[PDB]
Design a protein around this ligand. Structure first.
Ligand SMILES: O=c1ccn([C@@H]2O[C@H](COP(=O)(O)OP(=O)(O)O)[C@@H](O)[C@H]2O)c(=O)[nH]1
Ligand SMILES: [Cl-]
Length: 282
C-alpha cells in the first residue's frame, strides 16, 4: 500500500509520535507524512515526502487522502478525535491504523497501543466491530540501537541518566538534577527543540558532575552507561524496559497516567508532583 502518516512534532508536542512513527515506517515501502509546520518539529529529520498542512482542518487531510489515493492512514495524533476518524472513514474509505496511549475510543481498523501496560481487553467497546486490537510490549516500536545495545556490556560512567523526552517544556531536567548530590555523576539528554536549552546549558556549565548531551545519536548507549535512569513515563519507558534498566519514572503530563499506574504496580518509583501547576516552569 501507499501509506500516509498523520502525526505532528514540536517543542510543545514532543518527539515521541514522530520518532516511533519513523520506526513503524520501516515496515512499509511507500510512505508519506502529513505534518503541520510547527516550531521545533522534526520535519527535517523525516526522510519521506512530507505534505505540509496549511490548517488543522480535517477536510484538508481528507482531500490529501483522496487526491493521492493513500490506502493506509496511520494516525498518531492526540488532536484527531474519534469523530474525525469516523469522518475520514466515511469520506475516503481508507484503512485506518490509530495509535492510542491513554485507553480512549477510536474509529479505526487497527488499534495500536505500543505501551507495556496495555491489554486488548482495555479496549472492549472502545473500537469498531472489525477492529484488530494490538496492545503491549510485543508491539513496542523501539529504535535499532536499543536492540544492538541490550547485547553489549558497557562500563558504567554515570550514576544517573535524566531524560524528560525530546523537549522537556517544564525544564524538569534542571529541577531533577538540582536535587541530586554534587558528587553523583549525572548525564542529561535533551534536544535542540527544548525551549529551556540556554538555561539548562548555563546550569550544566556550573556543575562539573553534570554532562549534558544535546541531540545525541545513541540514547541506548547513554542509558546502558548509567546506573539509574530518571525518565518521563513516555516512549523512554519501553526503551528502558528493553534494556532492563533500573529507573524512576516521572509522570510528566496527564496522558502518561496509564503507564505511570502500571509502573507503580510493578514496583518502580513513580513521581506525580510535576503534574501540579506550580511546576510548569523551572
Ligand atoms: O535528546 C533526546 C531525547 C529523547 N530522544 C528520544 O526521543 C523520544 C522521546 O519520545 P517520548 O515519548 O519519550 O517523549 P516526548 O518527546 O514525546 O515528550 C524517545 O524515543 C527518546 O529515546 C532522543 O532521541 N534524543
Ligand atoms: Cl530504527
Amino acid at each position: 500500500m501507499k501509506v500516509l502518516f498523520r502525526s505532528d512534532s514540536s517543542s510543545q508536542i514532543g518527539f515521541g509520535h514522530i520518532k516511533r512513527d519513523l520506526v513503524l515506517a520501516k515496515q512499509y515501502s511507500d510512505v508519506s507524512f502529513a505534518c503541520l509546520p510547527l516550531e521545533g518539529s522534526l520535519i527535517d529529520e523525516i526522510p519521506y515526502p512530507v505534505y505540509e498542512l496549511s490548517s488543522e482542518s480535517i477536510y484538508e487531510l481528507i482531500n490529501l487522502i483522496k487526491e493521492e489515493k493513500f490506502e493506509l492512514l496511520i494516525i498518531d495524533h492526540y488532536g484527531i478525535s474519534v469523530d474525525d476518524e469516523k469522518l475520514i472513514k466515511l469520506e475516503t474509505g481508507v484503512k485506518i491504523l490509530s495509535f492510542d496511549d491513554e485507553i480512549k475510543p477510536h474509529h479505526c481498523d487497527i488499534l495500536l497501543n505500543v505501551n507495556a501496560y496495555a491489554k486488548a481487553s482495555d479496549y472492549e467497546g472502545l473500537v469498531p466491530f472489525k477492529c484488530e486490537v494490538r496492545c503491549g510490549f510485543s508491539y513496542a516500536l523501539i529504535r535499532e540501537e536499543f536492540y544492538q545495545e541490550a547485547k553489549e556490556n558497557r562500563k558504567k560512567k554515570y550514576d544517573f541518566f535524566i531524560c524528560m523526552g525530546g523537549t522537556d517544556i517544564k525544564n524538569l531536567s534542571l529541577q531533577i538534577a538540582s536535587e541530586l548530590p554534587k558528587t553523583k555523576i549525572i548525564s542529561i539528554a535533551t534536544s535542540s527543540s527544548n525551549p529551556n536549552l540556554k538555561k539548562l546549558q548555563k546550569f550544566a556549565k556550573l556543575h562539573n558532575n553534570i554532562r549534558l548531551f544535546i541531540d545525541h545519536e545513541n540514547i541506548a548507549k547513554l542509558m546502558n552507561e548509567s546506573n539509574k535512569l530518571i525518565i518521563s513515563a513516555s516512549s523512554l519507558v519501553n526503551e528502558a524496559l528493553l534494556l532492563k534498566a533500573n529507573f524512576k519514572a516521572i509522570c510528566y503530563v496527564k496522558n502518561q497516567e496509564s503507564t505511570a499506574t502500571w509502573l507503580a504496580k510493578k514496583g518502580y518509583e513513580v513521581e506525580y508532583k510535576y503534574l501540579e501547576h506550580h511546576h510548569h516552569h523551572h
